[PDB]
């Protein structure tokens, strides 16, 4: 009974491997020989945001390219103004540990989550004049690792008990749930058209989940260790992942396999965040050896390096207009890099 | 541009209020020390939390000793896979690790699992500045189990027969020297693990505890005192 299902599983995986080798007509790194290189990208630090006590764990730029949410481990959730470096709101948290924060595309809500198993959605309207807990979500059994806003009334969350969830913020209940993984699901990233999203876990797999349908469609297994970050290419037809085997990988949603691998022999440290640029030609990658490498995303060469931090880079965010790039590390500082 | 100056004034007043709030919360956050309470579920850390007092994922205990505040964070309804959330715990002032010594002649060799887990914690890259305090539980139970007729520990550890009681570690009166040999054997296991790396950045503190006992809090206070003093001596390039 088990043998006739495991042999059929191995046959279907051989069929998938043979369709991927059949569709492998060439590589991206051959047809990009005659492309002008992007030269040494020399970015400068313009700002340095202070005022945190414990290590900064995650950040998220707003859609206006103006405000950014930063989340620390002392229990503070600060809303920053990137231009003037003025703190606009500072929120004290009931629990200390936060692993995710998310700034709504309308600017009305801010979500945060961590070890408490509870996603706290805060309202920034505040007709009284004080920030207050709008609604707290509790339906997980693991740890809450990432969350993202589709819009004002729906939120996708990523847990540590092998499940993802889609909530309704009005009712407070889970609209649906996504059970395909077999390990800790570390982060997720939303498509621009907010219909699909990709999820990276600790079994070296990335799943493509359909929000409206409710089941997964593709599984990409190109890595060797735990996948920490994931992020879409701006057009929504490709996406880059960062694992702990020190390699970045660039995958495709129609070729149904990987397109390129980014690796350098002097680098043996983990990846903790990636993010594309606005055009997609640069890929920023936050490594564990205290610097952020600027890869040329069509030549697989290092265009540059951002060696500003004094401790492990934990989060990395690029604005929607590509005007600046913010990095947050465990030394409690936010560097705002901006190339000149 | 007068309105723009009004808005700048507004944002500077906001910034000053928020910086006052942060300066008032920085004292509170640097005063209170932080403990991570990690133990197997068979080991009675529930007894330790109930003594400490006298659906959510993480559990929290706030107390004070000699007007010094201590938060003790219990890991509750979490997953068995510990390798990702343990990286969030590199800023606590200590990790207290509680293991139960079972030696009745038992689904698995829980002591070997405990040794492997302690080794994983000790050699982890981001736990190389966090000290570990160590509680060996069920010592009264280990006294009760010498009269089983046979020995579990010698079966599971072939070095127990070729082991001598340390001359320099005095036993309490009224204890069976077999049981004391057991205790010191397990303590030497954990000290060999802790001494193998020999980094000296972080240390391991073995202590004993009974099923019902009250000195535990004083032990944890004194060992946090030792960890802070050794960290200050580390900062002055003296150790």
């Amino acid at each position, epitope marked *: 009974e088990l043998d006739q299902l495991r042999q059929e599983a191995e046959q279907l995986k051989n069929q998938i491997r043979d369709a991927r080798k059949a569709c492998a007509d060439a590589t991206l790194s051959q047809i990009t020989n005659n492309i002008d290189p992007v030269g040494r990208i020399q970015m400068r630090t313009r700002r340095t945001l202070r005022g945190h006590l414990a290590k900064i764990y995650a950040m998220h730029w707003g859609t206006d390219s103006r405000l950014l949410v930063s989340a620390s481990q002392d229990g503070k959730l600060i809303i920053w103004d990137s231009y003037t470096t003025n703190k606009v709101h500072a929120i004290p948290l009931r629990s200390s540990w936060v692993m995710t924060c998310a700034y709504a595309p309308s600017g009305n809500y801010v979500a945060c989550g961590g070890l408490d198993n509870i996603c706290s959605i805060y309202n920034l309207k505040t007709r009284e004049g004080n920030v207050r807990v709008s609604r707290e979500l509790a339906g997980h059994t693991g740890y809450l690792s990432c969350c993202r806003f589709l819009d004002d009334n729906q939120i996708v969350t990523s847990s540590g008990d092998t499940t993802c969830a889609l909530w309704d913020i009005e009712t407070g209940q889970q609209t649906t749930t996504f059970t395909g993984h077999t*390990g800790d699901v570390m982060s997720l990233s939303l498509a621009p058209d907010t219909r699909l999203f990709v999820s990276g876990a600790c079994d070296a797999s990335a799943k493509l989940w359909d929000v409206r349908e409710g089941m997964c469609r593709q599984t990409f297994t190109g890595h060797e260790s735990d996948i920490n970050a994931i992020c879409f290419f701006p057009n929504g037809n490709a996406f880059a992942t960062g694992s702990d085997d020190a390699t970045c990988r660039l995958f495709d949603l129609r070729a149904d396999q990987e397109l390129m691998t980014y690796s350098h022999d002097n680098i043996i440290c983990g990846i903790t965040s990636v993010s594309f640029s606005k055009s997609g030609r640069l890929l920023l990658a936050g490594y564990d050896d205290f610097n952020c490498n600027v890869w040329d995303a069509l030549k697989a060469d290092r265009a540059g390096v951002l060696a500003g931090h004094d401790n492990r880079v934990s989060c990395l965010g690029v604005t929607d207009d590509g005007m600046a790039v913010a990095t947050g590390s465990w030394d409690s500082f936010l560097k705002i890099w901006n190339g000149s | 541009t007068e309105d723009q100056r009004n808005e700048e004034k507004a944002q500077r007043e906001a910034n000053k209020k928020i910086e006052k709030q942060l300066q008032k919360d920085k004292q509170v956050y640097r005063a209170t020390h932080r403990l991570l309470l990690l133990g197997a579920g068979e080991s009675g850390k529930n007894t330790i939390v109930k003594q400490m007092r006298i659906t959510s994922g993480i559990f929290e205990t706030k107390f004070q000793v000699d007007k010094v505040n201590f938060h003790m964070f219990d890991v509750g309804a979490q997953r068995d896979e510990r390798r990702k959330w343990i990286q969030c715990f590199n800023d606590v002032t200590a990790i207290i690790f509680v293991v139960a010594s079972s030696s009745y002649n038992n689904q698995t060799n829980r002591l070997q699992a405990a040794l492997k887990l302690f080794d994983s914690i000790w*050699n982890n890259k981001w736990l190389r500045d966090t000290s570990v305090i160590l509680f060996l539980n069920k010592q009264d139970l280990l006294a009760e189990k010498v009269l089983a007729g046979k020995s579990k520990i010698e079966d599971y550890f*072939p070095e127990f027969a070729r082991y001598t009681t340390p001359e320099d570690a005095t036993p309490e009166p009224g204890e069976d020297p077999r049981v004391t040999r057991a205790k010191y054997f397990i303590r030497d296991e954990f000290l060999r693990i802790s001494t193998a790396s020999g980094d000296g950045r972080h240390y391991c503190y073995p202590h004993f505890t009974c099923a019902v006992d009250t000195e535990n809090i004083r032990r944890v206070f004194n060992d946090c005192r030792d960890i802070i003093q050794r960290m200050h001596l580390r900062q002055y390039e003296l150790l």
Partner: nanobody, 128 residues
């Protein structure tokens, strides 16, 4: 794709000998510390033995120490476990497990809740 294929096993008699194999396909084999873990019928998972990257540092579980020989072949990409002087208490399912990060010394691989980085395992039974 990380895949681990155990090989060998079967019904044996006590005092005998048996060699097990672990075919490690789909990763850079020479950089990962590996280990062997066993599951007794109706009991929990327990660690058996391990082996580092180069092969220098080796350790075993106490109760089978000096009875088992663990050896990695980086050339042929294969982990070998030699088991002589067998005991009736050693019947179990065997699991060839890998530590999750490369270039490290710690492992977290005793987890029964669907740990991804071990093989399907092989049955070894001692019948008198």
């Amino acid at each position: 794709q990380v895949q681990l294929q155990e090989s060998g096993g079967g019904l044996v008699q006590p005092g005998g000998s048996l060699r097990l194999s672990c075919a490690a396909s789909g990763f850079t084999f020479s950089n990962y510390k590996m280990n062997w873990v066993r599951q007794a019928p109706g009991k929990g998972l327990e660690w058996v033995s391990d082996i580092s990257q180069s092969g220098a540092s080796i350790s075993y579980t106490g109760s089978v120490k000096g009875r088992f020989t663990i050896s990695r072949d980086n050339a042929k990409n294969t982990l070998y476990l030699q088991m002589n002087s067998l005991k009736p208490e050693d019947t179990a399912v065997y699991y060839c497990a890998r530590c999750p990060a490369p270039f490290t010394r710690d492992c977290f691989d005793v987890t029964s809740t669907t740990y991804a980085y071990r093989g399907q395992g092989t049955q070894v039974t001692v019948s008198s």
